[PDB]
Structure formats: structure tokens, C-alpha cells
Design an enzyme around this catalytic site. Structure first.
Site, short mmCIF file in Angstrom:
data_model
loop_
_atom_site.label_atom_id
_atom_site.label_comp_id
_atom_site.label_asym_id
_atom_site.label_seq_id
_atom_site.Cartn_x
_atom_site.Cartn_y
_atom_site.Cartn_z
CG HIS A 194 -0.63 -0.33 2.47
ND1 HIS A 194 -0.63 -1.59 2.93
CD2 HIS A 194 -0.30 0.54 3.49
CE1 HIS A 194 -0.23 -1.55 4.17
NE2 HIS A 194 -0.06 -0.29 4.57
CG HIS A 216 3.70 5.79 5.81
ND1 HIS A 216 3.80 5.58 7.12
CD2 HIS A 216 2.47 6.27 5.45
CE1 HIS A 216 2.61 5.93 7.63
NE2 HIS A 216 1.79 6.33 6.62
CG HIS A 232 -0.75 8.43 2.47
ND1 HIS A 232 -1.45 7.24 2.44
CD2 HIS A 232 -0.24 8.62 3.67
CE1 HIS A 232 -1.41 6.78 3.69
NE2 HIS A 232 -0.66 7.58 4.48
CD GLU A 272 -3.88 9.42 4.16
OE1 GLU A 272 -3.46 9.24 5.25
OE2 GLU A 272 -4.54 8.54 3.41
CG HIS A 311 1.19 10.29 7.26
ND1 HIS A 311 0.26 9.48 6.67
CD2 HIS A 311 0.78 11.58 7.22
CE1 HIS A 311 -0.73 10.30 6.33
NE2 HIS A 311 -0.46 11.55 6.60
CB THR A 331 -5.07 7.74 7.06
OG1 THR A 331 -3.79 7.28 6.66
CG2 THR A 331 -5.02 9.01 7.86
CB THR A 332 -4.23 2.43 6.05
OG1 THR A 332 -3.40 2.09 7.15
CG2 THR A 332 -3.57 3.55 5.30
#
Ligand SMILES: NCCOCCOCCNC(=O)c1ccc(S(N)(=O)=O)cc1
Ligand SMILES: [Hg+2]
Ligand SMILES: [Zn+2]
Length: 256
Positions: free
Chosen positions: A61, A91, A93, A103, A116, A195-196
Site C-alpha cells: 500500500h 511513509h 501517500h 490525505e 507521515h 488513515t488505513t
């Protein structure tokens, strides 16, 4: 399982993780005119001089840069937090296009990516225990805007070749996270979640006001990663971000 596709995307996550419609998710829209300037908020304390990066891994992901968190090497304190928070991984996004990827949004504005920096509250002893507490985690979010190259990000960009598909890892030592921080530490903070999936509501979010700038070519290499494992049909790792969630009477505080 969960993903960011049309059949297993954010819109579906509630089915396996009912907390998805909880009272304190993550991400949210930052309304700068409604944010409350809190004078009692102290300045952030980021001690990363001793950070010890170990490896980079494609988890299907995103790609995570893991740090040794066996000791108080790289910590986060001050701000709205109480106690010491240890950096475990970082990580990002990102989007398939520059107009999307972040996000969190600021006045409904979306950035090209979001970094993040994940930290866990040491009083809880380990990461696993921390995810069971409402003040368990602190995530430092940094917006990425397309412009000039970010020198300190290149090391990461160059190793992406090596972890193209899901499950691949590579040694990644002597990486200094300090190279990713903006000049200012002015932030917004609110109680939220991961968020996941599992979308656990144990995070104290700290979103930096000032975006860092990266080059088009830098962002481009992110988009070369695969969701899939080797030998499977190629599925580009883009748009791995969750849409804004309802604030639900939560209040966003500003350090400025
Ligand atoms: N025994 C309990 C296990 O706890 C499960 C926690 O999930 C572990 C994997 N996920 C993360 O570590 C994790 C960390 C940060 C963010 S985010 N995107 O909100 O920064 C999302 C996910
Ligand atoms: Hg929690
Ligand atoms: Zn994240």
C-alpha cells in the site's frame, strides 16, 4: 483485502473495519478560519540527530522506512503531547497526478503527497500496546508540493528501484529524517486515527503548516511502484490516500 481500487477502496473499508465510521477519523479538512489558535500549545521538540534507519519495505500500500525504536534515539515531544514519542517508521501517500495525493486538506486544498512520521508513546512499552490507547500514537504530517527538488529525499527515490513490488525490502541505513522537515514547525493538531485499516483511534495528529517542495521527477519515481507482488499483473501504486472524514464536533487547534 483492503486497497484503493474501485472494489476494495476506502468506501468499502467499513465492512471489515466498522470503526471506519467512528467519531475520530482521519484524515480531515483543515478549515483555517475555524481552527482555534491555542496560546497554551508549546513548540514541537523534534530530536532526530540520533535516528537509526534500518530498511525500506514495500508493503503493498506504500513503502515504509523503518527505524530502530529499541531506545529513545529519534523522539517527538512538546506540542500538544505529554511524554516521549518514538519514531518507528515514515511513509507517504501520493497521487497519480500533482493535484491530488495528500490525505489532509487545508481549506479544501489537496497537495501532491503527504509524509507521515509515525511515533508511539513510550509509556506503553511497545508499538502494539500503544495502538490500544487513545494517546498511543502521534503522527507528524508534512505536505509535499511540486516545485524544486528536495535534496534530502533523493536517497529514498534512488532505492525505489529495488522494492518495486509488494513484499520486497532493502537495507536502508544512515538515513537522516531531518532532511525532510520544513523550515517552520508551526502546526495544527487534533485527535484522530490511522488513515488505513485498522483505522484505530489512537492518534494525536500534528500537521505542519508549511509544505516541503519536491521535484516533478522525484514524485514521478513514487508512481513507478507496484501494489502487486512480483509475477502478478502490474498495478501502479498511485492514489493510496483516504478522503477527508467528518470532523464531528472535534476541534482543530493551531499553534499559530
Ligand atoms: N496488536 C495491535 C496491532 O495494531 C495494528 C496496527 O496496524 C499496524 C500497521 N499500520 C501502521 O502502523 C500505521 C501507521 C500509521 C498510519 S497513518 N497512515 O495514519 O500514518 C497508518 C498505519
Ligand atoms: Hg486506540
Ligand atoms: Zn500515512
Amino acid at each position: 483485502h483492503w486497497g484503493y481500487g474501485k472494489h476494495n477502496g476506502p468506501e468499502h473499508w467499513h465492512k471489515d473495519f466498522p470503526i471506519a465510521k467512528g467519531e475520530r477519523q482521519s484524515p480531515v479538512d483543515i478549515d483555517t478560519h475555524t481552527a482555534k489558535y491555542d496560546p497554551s500549545l508549546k513548540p514541537l521538540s523534534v530530536s532526530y540527530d540520533q535516528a537509526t534507519s534500518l530498511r525500506i519495505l514495500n508493503n503493498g500500500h506504500a513503502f515504509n522506512v523503518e527505524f530502530d525504536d529499541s531506545q529513545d534515539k529519534a523522539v517527538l515531544k512538546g506540542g500538544p503531547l505529554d511524554g516521549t514519542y518514538r519514531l518507528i517508521q515514515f511513509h507517504f501517500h501520493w497521487g497519480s497526478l500533482d493535484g491530488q495525493g495528500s490525505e489532509h486538506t487545508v481549506d479544501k486544498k489537496k497537495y501532491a503527497a503527504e509524509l507521515h512520521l509515525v511515533h508511539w508513546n513510550t509509556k506503553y512499552g511497545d508499538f502494539g500496546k500503544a495502538v490500544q490507547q487513545p494517546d498511543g500514537l502521534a503522527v507528524l504530517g508534512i505536505f509535499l508540493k511540486v516545485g524544486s527538488a528536495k535534496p534530502g529525499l533523493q536517497k529514498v527515490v534512488d532505492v525505489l528501484d529495488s522494492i518495486k513490488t509488494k513484499g520486497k525490502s532493502a537495507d536502508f541505513t544512515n538515513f537522516d529524517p531531518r532532511g525532510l522537515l520544513p523550515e517552520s514547525l508551526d502546526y495544527w493538531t487534533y485527535p484522530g486515527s490511522l488513515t488505513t485499516p485498522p483505522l484505530l483511534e489512537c492518534v494525536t495528529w500534528i500537521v505542519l503548516k508549511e509544505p516541503i517542495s519536491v521535484s516533478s521527477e522525484q514524485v514521478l519515481k513514487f508512481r513507478k511502484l507496484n501494489f502487486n507482488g512480483e509475477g502478478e499483473p502490474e498495478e501502479l501504486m498511485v492514489d493510496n490516500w483516504r478522503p477527508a472524514q467528518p470532523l464531528k464536533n472535534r476541534q482543530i487547534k493551531a499553534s499559530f
